[PDB]
Short mmCIF file of all heavy atoms in Angstrom, two decimals:
data_model
loop_
_atom_site.label_atom_id
_atom_site.label_comp_id
_atom_site.label_asym_id
_atom_site.label_seq_id
_atom_site.Cartn_x
_atom_site.Cartn_y
_atom_site.Cartn_z
N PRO L 1 58.48 3.60 27.08
CA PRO L 1 57.22 4.29 27.42
C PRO L 1 56.00 3.43 27.16
O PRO L 1 55.04 3.44 27.94
CB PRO L 1 57.25 5.54 26.53
CG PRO L 1 58.69 5.73 26.19
CD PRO L 1 59.24 4.35 26.06
N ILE L 2 56.04 2.64 26.08
CA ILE L 2 54.97 1.69 25.82
C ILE L 2 54.91 0.65 26.93
O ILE L 2 53.83 0.22 27.33
CB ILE L 2 55.15 1.04 24.44
CG1 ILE L 2 55.48 2.10 23.39
CG2 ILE L 2 53.90 0.28 24.04
CD1 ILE L 2 55.74 1.53 22.01
N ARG L 3 56.07 0.23 27.43
CA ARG L 3 56.11 -0.73 28.54
C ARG L 3 55.46 -0.15 29.79
O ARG L 3 54.71 -0.83 30.50
CB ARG L 3 57.55 -1.14 28.83
CG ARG L 3 57.76 -1.77 30.19
CD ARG L 3 59.22 -2.09 30.44
NE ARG L 3 59.47 -2.48 31.82
CZ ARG L 3 60.65 -2.83 32.31
NH1 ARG L 3 61.73 -2.86 31.54
NH2 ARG L 3 60.76 -3.15 33.59
N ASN L 4 55.76 1.12 30.09
CA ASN L 4 55.12 1.78 31.22
C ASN L 4 53.61 1.85 31.02
O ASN L 4 52.83 1.68 31.96
CB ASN L 4 55.70 3.18 31.41
CG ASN L 4 57.19 3.15 31.73
OD1 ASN L 4 57.84 2.11 31.62
ND2 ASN L 4 57.73 4.30 32.12
N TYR L 5 53.18 2.10 29.77
CA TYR L 5 51.76 2.06 29.45
C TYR L 5 51.17 0.68 29.72
O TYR L 5 50.07 0.57 30.28
CB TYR L 5 51.54 2.47 28.00
CG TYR L 5 50.30 1.88 27.37
CD1 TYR L 5 49.04 2.41 27.65
CD2 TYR L 5 50.37 0.80 26.51
CE1 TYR L 5 47.90 1.88 27.08
CE2 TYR L 5 49.23 0.26 25.93
CZ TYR L 5 48.00 0.81 26.22
OH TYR L 5 46.87 0.28 25.66
N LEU L 6 51.87 -0.38 29.32
CA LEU L 6 51.38 -1.74 29.54
C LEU L 6 51.22 -2.02 31.03
O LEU L 6 50.22 -2.60 31.47
CB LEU L 6 52.32 -2.77 28.91
CG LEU L 6 52.96 -2.60 27.54
CD1 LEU L 6 53.93 -3.73 27.27
CD2 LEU L 6 51.95 -2.48 26.41
N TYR L 7 52.22 -1.62 31.82
CA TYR L 7 52.14 -1.82 33.26
C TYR L 7 51.00 -1.03 33.88
O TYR L 7 50.30 -1.53 34.77
CB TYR L 7 53.47 -1.43 33.92
CG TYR L 7 54.53 -2.51 33.91
CD1 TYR L 7 55.41 -2.64 32.84
CD2 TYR L 7 54.67 -3.39 34.97
CE1 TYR L 7 56.39 -3.62 32.83
CE2 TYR L 7 55.64 -4.37 34.97
CZ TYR L 7 56.50 -4.48 33.90
OH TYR L 7 57.47 -5.46 33.89
N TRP L 8 50.78 0.20 33.41
CA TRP L 8 49.75 1.05 34.01
C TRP L 8 48.36 0.69 33.49
O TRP L 8 47.35 1.00 34.15
CB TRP L 8 50.06 2.52 33.73
N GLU L 9 48.27 0.05 32.33
CA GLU L 9 46.98 -0.20 31.69
C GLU L 9 46.15 -1.19 32.52
O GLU L 9 46.62 -2.30 32.80
CB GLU L 9 47.19 -0.74 30.28
N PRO L 10 44.93 -0.83 32.91
CA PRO L 10 44.09 -1.80 33.63
C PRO L 10 43.51 -2.88 32.74
O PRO L 10 43.42 -4.04 33.17
CB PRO L 10 42.99 -0.91 34.24
CG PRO L 10 42.90 0.26 33.32
CD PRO L 10 44.29 0.50 32.80
N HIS L 11 43.13 -2.54 31.51
CA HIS L 11 42.65 -3.51 30.54
C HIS L 11 43.77 -4.10 29.70
O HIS L 11 43.52 -4.57 28.58
CB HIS L 11 41.59 -2.88 29.63
CG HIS L 11 40.18 -3.15 30.07
ND1 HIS L 11 39.88 -3.78 31.26
CD2 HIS L 11 38.99 -2.88 29.48
CE1 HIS L 11 38.57 -3.88 31.39
NE2 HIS L 11 38.01 -3.34 30.32
N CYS L 12 45.00 -4.08 30.21
CA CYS L 12 46.14 -4.60 29.46
C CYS L 12 46.00 -6.09 29.20
O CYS L 12 46.36 -6.59 28.13
CB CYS L 12 47.43 -4.30 30.22
SG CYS L 12 48.94 -4.81 29.40
N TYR L 13 45.46 -6.82 30.18
CA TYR L 13 45.41 -8.28 30.11
C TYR L 13 44.22 -8.81 29.33
O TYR L 13 44.21 -10.00 28.98
CB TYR L 13 45.39 -8.87 31.53
N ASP L 14 43.22 -7.98 29.04
CA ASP L 14 41.99 -8.51 28.46
C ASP L 14 42.03 -8.58 26.93
O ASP L 14 42.21 -9.67 26.36
CB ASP L 14 40.80 -7.66 28.91
CG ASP L 14 40.58 -7.72 30.41
OD1 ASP L 14 40.75 -8.82 30.99
OD2 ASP L 14 40.23 -6.68 31.01
N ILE L 15 41.86 -7.45 26.25
CA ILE L 15 41.69 -7.45 24.80
C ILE L 15 43.01 -7.62 24.05
O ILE L 15 43.14 -8.57 23.26
CB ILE L 15 40.99 -6.16 24.33
CG1 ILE L 15 39.66 -5.97 25.06
CG2 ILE L 15 40.76 -6.20 22.83
CD1 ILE L 15 38.96 -4.67 24.74
N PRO L 16 44.01 -6.75 24.24
CA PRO L 16 45.11 -6.68 23.28
C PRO L 16 46.25 -7.62 23.62
O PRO L 16 46.22 -8.37 24.60
CB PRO L 16 45.54 -5.21 23.38
CG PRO L 16 45.31 -4.89 24.83
CD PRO L 16 44.22 -5.80 25.35
N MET L 17 47.28 -7.56 22.77
CA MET L 17 48.57 -8.18 23.05
C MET L 17 49.36 -7.41 24.10
O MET L 17 50.55 -7.70 24.30
CB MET L 17 49.39 -8.27 21.76
CG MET L 17 49.73 -6.91 21.17
SD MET L 17 50.93 -6.98 19.83
CE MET L 17 51.09 -5.23 19.44
N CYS L 18 48.74 -6.41 24.73
CA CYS L 18 49.37 -5.68 25.82
C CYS L 18 49.83 -6.64 26.90
O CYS L 18 50.92 -6.48 27.46
CB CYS L 18 48.38 -4.66 26.40
SG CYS L 18 49.03 -3.64 27.74
N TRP L 19 49.01 -7.65 27.20
CA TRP L 19 49.38 -8.62 28.22
C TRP L 19 50.61 -9.41 27.82
O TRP L 19 51.51 -9.63 28.63
CB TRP L 19 48.21 -9.55 28.51
CG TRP L 19 48.52 -10.57 29.56
CD1 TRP L 19 48.44 -11.93 29.43
CD2 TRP L 19 48.99 -10.32 30.89
NE1 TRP L 19 48.82 -12.53 30.61
CE2 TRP L 19 49.16 -11.57 31.52
CE3 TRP L 19 49.28 -9.16 31.62
CZ2 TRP L 19 49.61 -11.69 32.83
CZ3 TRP L 19 49.72 -9.28 32.92
CH2 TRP L 19 49.88 -10.54 33.52
N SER L 20 50.67 -9.84 26.55
CA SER L 20 51.83 -10.59 26.08
C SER L 20 53.10 -9.75 26.19
O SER L 20 54.12 -10.21 26.73
CB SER L 20 51.61 -11.04 24.64
OG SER L 20 51.43 -9.93 23.78
N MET L 21 53.05 -8.51 25.71
CA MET L 21 54.24 -7.66 25.75
C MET L 21 54.63 -7.33 27.19
O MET L 21 55.82 -7.34 27.54
CB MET L 21 53.99 -6.38 24.94
CG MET L 21 53.72 -6.62 23.47
SD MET L 21 55.06 -7.53 22.65
CE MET L 21 56.43 -6.39 22.87
N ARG L 22 53.64 -7.04 28.04
CA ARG L 22 53.91 -6.71 29.43
C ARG L 22 54.52 -7.89 30.16
O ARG L 22 55.43 -7.72 30.98
CB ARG L 22 52.62 -6.25 30.11
CG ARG L 22 52.76 -5.97 31.60
CD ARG L 22 51.39 -5.72 32.23
NE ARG L 22 51.48 -5.49 33.66
CZ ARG L 22 50.44 -5.27 34.45
NH1 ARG L 22 49.20 -5.25 33.97
NH2 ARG L 22 50.64 -5.06 35.75
N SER L 23 54.04 -9.10 29.88
CA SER L 23 54.61 -10.29 30.52
C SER L 23 56.00 -10.60 29.98
O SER L 23 56.84 -11.12 30.71
CB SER L 23 53.68 -11.48 30.33
OG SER L 23 52.41 -11.23 30.91
N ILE L 24 56.26 -10.28 28.71
CA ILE L 24 57.63 -10.40 28.19
C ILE L 24 58.56 -9.46 28.96
O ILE L 24 59.67 -9.84 29.36
CB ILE L 24 57.66 -10.11 26.68
CG1 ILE L 24 57.00 -11.25 25.90
CG2 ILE L 24 59.09 -9.89 26.20
CD1 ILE L 24 57.04 -11.06 24.40
N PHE L 25 58.11 -8.23 29.19
CA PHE L 25 58.94 -7.28 29.94
C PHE L 25 59.08 -7.70 31.41
O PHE L 25 60.14 -7.50 32.02
CB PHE L 25 58.35 -5.88 29.82
CG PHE L 25 58.35 -5.36 28.41
CD1 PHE L 25 57.34 -4.53 27.96
CD2 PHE L 25 59.36 -5.73 27.53
CE1 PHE L 25 57.35 -4.06 26.66
CE2 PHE L 25 59.36 -5.26 26.23
CZ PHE L 25 58.36 -4.43 25.79
N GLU L 26 58.03 -8.29 31.98
CA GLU L 26 58.13 -8.84 33.33
C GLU L 26 59.14 -9.97 33.38
O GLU L 26 59.89 -10.11 34.36
CB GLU L 26 56.75 -9.32 33.80
CG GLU L 26 55.77 -8.20 34.09
CD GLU L 26 54.36 -8.71 34.33
OE1 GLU L 26 54.11 -9.90 34.05
OE2 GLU L 26 53.51 -7.92 34.79
N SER L 27 59.17 -10.81 32.34
CA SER L 27 60.18 -11.86 32.27
C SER L 27 61.58 -11.27 32.15
O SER L 27 62.53 -11.82 32.69
CB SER L 27 59.89 -12.79 31.09
OG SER L 27 59.95 -12.09 29.86
N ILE L 28 61.71 -10.16 31.42
CA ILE L 28 63.01 -9.48 31.34
C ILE L 28 63.44 -8.99 32.72
O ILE L 28 64.61 -9.14 33.11
CB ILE L 28 62.95 -8.34 30.30
CG1 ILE L 28 63.50 -8.80 28.95
CG2 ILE L 28 63.73 -7.12 30.78
CD1 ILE L 28 62.76 -9.98 28.35
N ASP L 29 62.52 -8.39 33.46
CA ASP L 29 62.82 -7.94 34.82
C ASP L 29 63.22 -9.12 35.70
O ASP L 29 64.17 -9.04 36.50
CB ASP L 29 61.62 -7.21 35.42
CG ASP L 29 61.14 -6.08 34.53
OD1 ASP L 29 61.81 -5.78 33.52
OD2 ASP L 29 60.07 -5.50 34.83
N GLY L 30 62.49 -10.23 35.58
CA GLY L 30 62.82 -11.41 36.35
C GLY L 30 64.16 -12.01 35.97
O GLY L 30 64.86 -12.57 36.81
N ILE L 31 64.53 -11.90 34.69
CA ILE L 31 65.85 -12.37 34.26
C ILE L 31 66.94 -11.49 34.84
O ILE L 31 68.02 -11.97 35.23
CB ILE L 31 65.92 -12.44 32.73
CG1 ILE L 31 65.04 -13.58 32.20
CG2 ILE L 31 67.35 -12.64 32.25
CD1 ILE L 31 64.99 -13.67 30.70
N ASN L 32 66.69 -10.18 34.92
CA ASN L 32 67.63 -9.29 35.60
C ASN L 32 67.78 -9.68 37.07
O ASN L 32 68.89 -9.73 37.61
CB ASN L 32 67.18 -7.84 35.46
CG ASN L 32 68.14 -6.86 36.11
OD1 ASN L 32 69.32 -7.16 36.28
ND2 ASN L 32 67.64 -5.69 36.48
N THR L 33 66.66 -9.97 37.73
CA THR L 33 66.72 -10.40 39.12
C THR L 33 67.43 -11.75 39.25
O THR L 33 68.12 -11.99 40.24
CB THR L 33 65.31 -10.47 39.71
OG1 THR L 33 64.59 -9.28 39.37
CG2 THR L 33 65.38 -10.60 41.23
N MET L 34 67.26 -12.62 38.26
CA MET L 34 67.96 -13.91 38.27
C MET L 34 69.46 -13.72 38.11
O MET L 34 70.26 -14.45 38.71
CB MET L 34 67.39 -14.79 37.15
CG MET L 34 67.96 -16.19 37.08
SD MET L 34 67.17 -17.16 35.78
CE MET L 34 68.05 -18.71 35.91
N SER L 35 69.86 -12.75 37.28
CA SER L 35 71.28 -12.40 37.19
C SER L 35 71.80 -11.88 38.52
O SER L 35 72.91 -12.23 38.94
CB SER L 35 71.48 -11.36 36.09
OG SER L 35 72.72 -10.70 36.24
N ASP L 36 71.01 -11.05 39.19
CA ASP L 36 71.38 -10.61 40.54
C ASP L 36 71.51 -11.79 41.48
O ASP L 36 72.40 -11.83 42.34
CB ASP L 36 70.35 -9.61 41.06
CG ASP L 36 70.20 -8.40 40.17
OD1 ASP L 36 70.89 -8.34 39.12
OD2 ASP L 36 69.41 -7.49 40.50
N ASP L 37 70.62 -12.78 41.34
CA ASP L 37 70.70 -13.98 42.16
C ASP L 37 71.98 -14.76 41.90
O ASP L 37 72.59 -15.29 42.83
CB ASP L 37 69.48 -14.87 41.90
CG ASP L 37 68.18 -14.19 42.26
OD1 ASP L 37 68.18 -13.32 43.15
OD2 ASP L 37 67.14 -14.54 41.65
N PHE L 38 72.39 -14.85 40.63
CA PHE L 38 73.66 -15.48 40.31
C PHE L 38 74.83 -14.72 40.93
O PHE L 38 75.77 -15.33 41.46
CB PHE L 38 73.83 -15.58 38.79
CG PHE L 38 73.26 -16.83 38.20
CD1 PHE L 38 71.90 -16.97 38.01
CD2 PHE L 38 74.10 -17.87 37.82
CE1 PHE L 38 71.38 -18.13 37.46
CE2 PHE L 38 73.58 -19.02 37.26
CZ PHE L 38 72.22 -19.15 37.09
N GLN L 39 74.79 -13.39 40.85
CA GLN L 39 75.82 -12.57 41.48
C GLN L 39 75.84 -12.73 43.00
O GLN L 39 76.89 -12.53 43.61
CB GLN L 39 75.63 -11.09 41.12
CG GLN L 39 76.34 -10.65 39.85
CD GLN L 39 75.54 -10.92 38.60
OE1 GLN L 39 74.64 -10.15 38.24
NE2 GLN L 39 75.84 -12.02 37.92
N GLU L 40 74.70 -13.04 43.60
CA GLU L 40 74.64 -13.36 45.03
C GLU L 40 75.15 -14.76 45.34
O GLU L 40 75.75 -14.98 46.40
CB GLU L 40 73.21 -13.21 45.55
CG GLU L 40 72.65 -11.80 45.47
CD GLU L 40 71.16 -11.76 45.71
OE1 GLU L 40 70.60 -12.79 46.14
OE2 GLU L 40 70.54 -10.70 45.47
N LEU L 41 74.89 -15.72 44.45
CA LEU L 41 75.28 -17.10 44.69
C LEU L 41 76.77 -17.33 44.48
O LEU L 41 77.34 -18.26 45.06
CB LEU L 41 74.48 -18.04 43.79
CG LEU L 41 73.01 -18.24 44.13
CD1 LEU L 41 72.39 -19.32 43.25
CD2 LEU L 41 72.84 -18.59 45.60
N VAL L 42 77.41 -16.52 43.63
CA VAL L 42 78.85 -16.69 43.41
C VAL L 42 79.66 -16.56 44.70
O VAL L 42 80.53 -17.41 44.94
CB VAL L 42 79.33 -15.73 42.30
CG1 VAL L 42 80.84 -15.57 42.35
CG2 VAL L 42 78.90 -16.26 40.95
N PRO L 43 79.44 -15.55 45.55
CA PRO L 43 80.19 -15.51 46.82
C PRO L 43 79.97 -16.73 47.69
O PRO L 43 80.86 -17.12 48.45
CB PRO L 43 79.68 -14.23 47.49
CG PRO L 43 79.25 -13.38 46.37
CD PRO L 43 78.66 -14.32 45.37
N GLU L 44 78.79 -17.35 47.62
CA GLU L 44 78.53 -18.56 48.40
C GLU L 44 79.47 -19.69 47.97
O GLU L 44 80.09 -20.35 48.81
CB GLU L 44 77.07 -18.98 48.24
CG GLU L 44 76.08 -17.88 48.57
CD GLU L 44 76.08 -17.50 50.03
OE1 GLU L 44 76.46 -18.35 50.87
OE2 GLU L 44 75.71 -16.35 50.36
N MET L 45 79.58 -19.92 46.66
CA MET L 45 80.51 -20.93 46.17
C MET L 45 81.95 -20.54 46.47
O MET L 45 82.79 -21.41 46.73
CB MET L 45 80.31 -21.15 44.68
CG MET L 45 79.13 -22.05 44.34
SD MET L 45 79.63 -23.55 43.47
CE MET L 45 80.76 -24.26 44.66
N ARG L 46 82.25 -19.24 46.45
CA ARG L 46 83.59 -18.79 46.82
C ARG L 46 83.91 -19.18 48.26
O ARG L 46 84.99 -19.70 48.56
CB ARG L 46 83.70 -17.28 46.62
CG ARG L 46 85.02 -16.68 47.06
CD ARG L 46 86.18 -17.20 46.23
NE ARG L 46 85.88 -17.24 44.81
CZ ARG L 46 85.78 -18.36 44.10
NH1 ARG L 46 85.99 -19.54 44.65
NH2 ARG L 46 85.47 -18.28 42.81
N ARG L 47 82.96 -18.94 49.17
CA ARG L 47 83.17 -19.28 50.57
C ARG L 47 83.29 -20.78 50.77
O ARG L 47 84.11 -21.25 51.57
CB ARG L 47 82.04 -18.69 51.42
CG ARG L 47 82.11 -17.18 51.54
CD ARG L 47 80.77 -16.54 51.86
NE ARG L 47 80.34 -16.80 53.23
CZ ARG L 47 79.31 -17.56 53.56
NH1 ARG L 47 78.58 -18.17 52.64
NH2 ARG L 47 78.99 -17.72 54.84
N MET L 48 82.49 -21.56 50.04
CA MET L 48 82.60 -23.02 50.14
C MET L 48 83.97 -23.51 49.66
O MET L 48 84.61 -24.34 50.32
CB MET L 48 81.48 -23.68 49.33
CG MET L 48 81.62 -25.18 49.19
SD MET L 48 80.27 -25.91 48.23
CE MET L 48 80.74 -27.64 48.23
#
Side-chain angles (χ1 to χ4, degrees), chain L residues 1-7 10-12 14-48:
Chain L
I2 314 177
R3 162 183 170 179
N4 298 11
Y5 153 78
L6 318 175
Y7 276 88
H11 264 7
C12 183
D14 296 322
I15 305 175
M17 64 170 181
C18 182
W19 180 237
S20 61
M21 298 303 298
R22 176 188 179 181
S23 299
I24 289 182
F25 297 147
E26 290 171 348
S27 63
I28 263 59
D29 307 352
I31 290 176
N32 182 24
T33 313
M34 184 177 179
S35 162
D36 302 1
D37 298 332
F38 271 77
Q39 271 85 82
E40 297 168 11
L41 288 187
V42 162
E44 306 293 335
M45 280 242 59
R46 176 64 44 246
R47 289 157 71 249
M48 171 180 180

